[PDB]
Amino acid sequence: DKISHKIDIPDSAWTIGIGEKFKNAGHPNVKYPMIDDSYVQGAPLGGFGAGTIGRTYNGGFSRWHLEIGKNKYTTVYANQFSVFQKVEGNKDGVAQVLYAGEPENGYLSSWKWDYPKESGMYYALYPNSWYTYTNKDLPVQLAVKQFSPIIPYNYKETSYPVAVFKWTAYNPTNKNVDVSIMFTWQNMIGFFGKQVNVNSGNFNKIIKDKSKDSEIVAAVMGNISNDNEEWNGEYSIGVKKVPGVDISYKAKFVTTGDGSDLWHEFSKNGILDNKDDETPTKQDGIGSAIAVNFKLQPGQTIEVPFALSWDLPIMKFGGGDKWYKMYTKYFGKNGKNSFAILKEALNNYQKWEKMIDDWQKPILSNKSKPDWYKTALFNELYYLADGGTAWENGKVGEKRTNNMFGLLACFDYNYYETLDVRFYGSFPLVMLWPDIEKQVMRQFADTINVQDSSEFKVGSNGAMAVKKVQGMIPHDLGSSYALPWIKINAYDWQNPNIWKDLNSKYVLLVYRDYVLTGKTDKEFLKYTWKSVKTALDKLKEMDKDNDGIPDNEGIPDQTYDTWSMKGTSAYCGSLWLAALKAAQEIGKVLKDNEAYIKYNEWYKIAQQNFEKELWNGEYYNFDTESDHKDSIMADQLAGQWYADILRLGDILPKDHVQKALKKIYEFNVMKFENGKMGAVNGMRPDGIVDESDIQAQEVWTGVTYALASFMKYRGMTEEAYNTAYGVYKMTYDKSGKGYWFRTPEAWTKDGNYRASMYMRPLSIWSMEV
């Protein structure tokens, strides 16, 4: 490997061999069907709300999130980079697709597949990833840096449906070598959203944009239809000329054929026919190819940028609503703008790289933090783009000031902005994209007094319940299968209108968003204040026995939605205390004296009773009325965790908090698989895992990262990082279970998982407050 010195890959990048087999991979641990796309994954390309494309460590474009809210894992074999090299003096050169695999059928059989093992590495530090190619049959060593412009405090480039592939080529040998790099792409219009005639009318055109000191050559892969539908738009690939490279292209090759129409050209001398051909296809799949060819002398390096864009302006959800995607603000809505997007990227990618470096540098340059922590901190952010992210710029047909936003809990449980989850998972948004965060919270504020008296069957028990109760915060803002933002509470496993955590978490999120954006946004507090008061007042009515605390009802009535709580729980009780303290402080800021007094009075009574009921001398009991009331819960002091972040002080005595956290580390971490797998949710005081429910026997990745943050704030530095380390290890390490770029909600002691591609572990960003 002589190419690594010519590029700049951070030491904290996650690494794997191209073509590496992983032996230890985990699988779902539930009895119902659940997504398992394998460990062949990579960092995604694409902006927020753009639809994303997962290119894996083997080189394939395989995890398709272009249909917003859906996860489709299938390798589109035509989509590749390929290389040709010929040493000056030799009769023939060699050509190789840069993909460690081959197609399942006979399409593209002429291409040279099966990029060999031990011949290159993949690296990722989101939003960047890299591949190096160090192959004994390729005298010139190559590397590519690929990324999308995901940039904190930037809501423009961050939305773009574009990727840059910045290639570096170096000749360490003593002979001249002719080199070509070719990008191939299938015209994917009709890949989704088209019920019949899936390729019909697809056509490819070539754009040559020549001005002084800029030449771009691009293929635009579209359809003859000017219809404005979810399926229609354009893909583009292209390259920018640099000194010493020539560009060649082929507008149309057949993807549903042997591929020799293209490959016979490329494999000969690395130069394509430059054949334009706009003839639309009927049944056959078609694609385009863009190549560069150059000669490298001994010791010479060259850099050349390619790009990919996709202009698919309309997202459709299963309930029938069609919305424009956010990026259409910047490029238009007609779906004929892929070239404009591509050109912006090719002309500005160097600036974007520097903007990315500028945001990563403060963390990367901090030599007190271990590399593994940096690996996790950056790579967990993949989910902000990959989580079915929806970001609208108008309903099709029907303008507003604001752009509604939603991130899925996950794909298996297809619910937008699940509030009990975002309490953990929304830290990157408040810290890095706060205008999105505040918009999402205003979305929740607007739902508080919505009433929907229609009934649904509760999954856990079969009982009928009212969809949405006035004054109760919704579980979620809908499903991609139905009507995001319009029909809330798509979740039906339990009835969220009787949950004891949603209303408190809502208030805590509101105050969090004020505190972590500088305690200056009084208008945000004003917008949400009525809903905050309503939320707390409604939750107070669920206090059955006048101890000042809402009563859990002996069913799962909170985020641990198969784990029953009864009476006063440490979890919901602490959240309630913290929410009351936050509302007191908002009351002070907004000069609402009567609210301050009321919530101060409720807080004092509740605090006193919480302590009496639950403090056992070593930790806080799980609850007051369950069979396993004395279980040690990892998340027992969640309210105090948020209180630390919100600077609300001691809701519980410092001594007791420290004892409880030490107990959790000693038991839930260190007595669970030697502390190498995170914090198990429930442990009995005899040191055996609580078996009352499956969720007690799970480590929740987001709960564990949040607990690490809590320990860190409380000065338990070793415990904090050791606790978080087990989550990193299981996700990323060779000794783990292969969950990179699909971090699950949970795993059991065997390492097998529940709900890959999950929002909650974005809580690792709470470790940076």
Ligand X SMILES: OC[C@H]1O[C@@H](O[C@H]2[C@H](O)[C@@H](O)[C@H](O[C@H]3[C@H](O)[C@@H](O)[C@H](O)O[C@@H]3CO)O[C@@H]2CO)[C@H](O)[C@@H](O)[C@@H]1O
Residue numbers of the site for Ca ion (CB under 5 A)?
A: 543, 545, 547, 549, 551
Q: Rank residues 371 and 545 by Cβ distance to Ca ion and give the closer one.
A: 545
Question: Interface with ligand X includes 562 (CB under 6 A)?
Answer: yes
Tokens found for residue 322:
């069609």
Of 311 and 547, CB closest to Ca ion: 547
Q: Which does 493 bind (CB under 5 to 8 A by kind): ligand X, Ca ion, none?
A: ligand X
Q: Which amino acid would we find at residue 279?
A: T
Q: Residue 392 or residue 547: which is nearer to Ca ion going by CB?
A: 547
Question: DSSP labels for 40-106?
Answer: ----EES-TTS-EEEE-TTS-EEEEE-STT--EE---TT-EEEEEEEETT-S--EEEES-SS--SSS
Min dist CB 610 to Ca ion, Å, is 10
> Residue 370's binding partner, choosing from ligand X, Ca ion, none, with beta-carbon cut-off 5 to 8 A by kind?
none
The listed partner (Ca ion, ligand X, none) that binds 674, CB under 5 to 8 Å by sort, is none
549 is in an annotated binding site: yes
Rg (CA), the chain: 27
For ligand X, give the closer residue by CB, 461 or 735.
461
Q: What is the DSSP letter of 669?
A: I
Q: Is 547 annotated as a binding residue?
A: yes
Contact, 535 vs 586, CB < 8 A?
no
Does 359 engage in binding with ligand X (CB under 6 A)? no
Q: Is 36 annotated as a binding residue?
A: no
Least spacing, CB of residue 576 vs Ca ion, in Å: 10
**DSSP character at residue 115:** P
* Contact partner, 549, from Ca ion, ligand X, none, Cβ < 5-8 Å per class: Ca ion
Q: Among 155, 192, 359, 493, which residue interacts with ligand X (rule: CB under 6 A)?
A: 493
Buried-state track 484-520, b at ≥16 Cβ within 10 A, e below 16: bbebbbbbbebbbbbbbbbbbbbbbbbbbbbbbbeee
Distance separating alpha carbons of residues 707 and 720, to the nearest angstrom: 7
Is 380 a binder of ligand X (CB under 6 A)?
Answer: no
Written as one letter, the residue type at 397 is: G
Give the C-alpha distances (Å, rounded to integers) separating 189 from 104, 233, 235, 284, 285. Answer: 22, 7, 8, 12, 10
Q: Is 49 left (phi over 0), alpha (psi -120 to 50) or beta?
A: left
Told to check if 372 binds ligand X by CB under 6 A, we report: no
Among 49, 52, 44, which Cα is nearest to 328's?
49
Spell out where 597-657 has E strands: 632-633
Contact string (CB under 6 A) for ligand X, positions 47-76, x = contact:
------------------------------
Q: Determine if 600 is a binding residue for ligand X (CB under 6 A).
A: no
Query: 545: annotated binding-site residue?
Result: yes
Task: Determine if 32 is a binding residue for ligand X (CB under 6 A).
Answer: yes
Query: How far apart (Å, rounded) are the C-alpha atoms in residues 116 and 266?
Result: 20
Does 23 bind ligand X (CB under 6 A)? Our answer is: no
**Residue showing tokens 């909170």:** 558
Q: Which of residues 456-485 bind ligand X (CB under 6 A)?
A: 459
- Total residues found in the chain within this entry: 769
Cβ–Cβ under 8 Å, residues 314 and 322: yes
Least gap, CB of 545 to Ca ion (angstroms): 5
List residues bridging with 304 in a β-sheet. 167
Of 480, 345, 469, nearest in space to 406 by CA: 480
Return the one option of Ca ion, ligand X, none that residue 417 interacts with (CB less than 5 to 8 A, by type): none
CA distance 494 to 503: 16
Query: 92 or 545, CB closer to Ca ion?
Result: 545
585 binds, among Ca ion, ligand X, none (CB under 5 to 8 A by kind): none
Instruction: Pick one of 31, 212, 354, 399: the residue that binds ligand X (CB under 6 A).
Output: 31
For tokens 């219809």, what's the residue? 227
- Of 561 and 719, which has the nearer Cβ to ligand X? 561
| Smallest separation (angstroms) from ligand X to the CB of 160 | 33
Q: Which residue in the block uniquely carries the two structure tokens 């070719």?
A: 182
Question: Quick one: what does residue 551 bind among ligand X, Ca ion, none, with the CB cut-off 5 to 8 Å set by partner type?
Answer: Ca ion
Work out how close the CB of 760 gets to ligand X at its nearest, in angstroms, rounded to a whole number. Answer: 11
| Of 545 and 691, CB closest to Ca ion | 545
- From residue 111 to residue 140, what is the string marking binding to ligand X with x (rule CB under 6 A)? ------------------------------
**DSSP state letters, 138-197:** -SSEEEEEEE----TT-SSGGG--EEEEEEEEE--SSS-EEEEEEEEEE--TTSSS-SS-
Q: 127 preceded by cis ω (within 30°)?
A: yes
Q: Smallest gap, in angstroms, from Cβ of residue 504 to ligand X? A: 19
Nearer to ligand X, 36 or 630 (CB): 36
Binds 32: which of ligand X, Ca ion, none (CB < 5-8 Å by kind): ligand X
Q: How far is the CB of 745 from ligand X (least distance, A)?
A: 8
Task: Count CB-CB contacts under 10 A for residue 526.
Answer: 12
Indicate which single residue of 185, 413, 524, 599 sits in contact with ligand X (rule: CB under 6 A).
Answer: 413
| Of 585 and 635, CB closest to ligand X | 635
Q: How far is the CB of 143 from ligand X (least distance, A)?
A: 42
Comparison of 252 and 468: residue with beta carbon closer to ligand X: 468
Nearer to ligand X, 31 or 367 (CB): 31
235 lies in the binding site for ligand X (CB under 6 A): no
CB of 552 to Ca ion, least distance (A): 9
- 8 A C-beta contact, residue 241 and residue 303: no
Interface ranges with ligand X (CB under 6 A): 31-32, 413, 459, 493, 561-562
Known binding-site residue numbers for Ca(2+): 543, 545, 547, 549, 551
Known binding-site residue numbers: 543, 545, 547, 549, 551
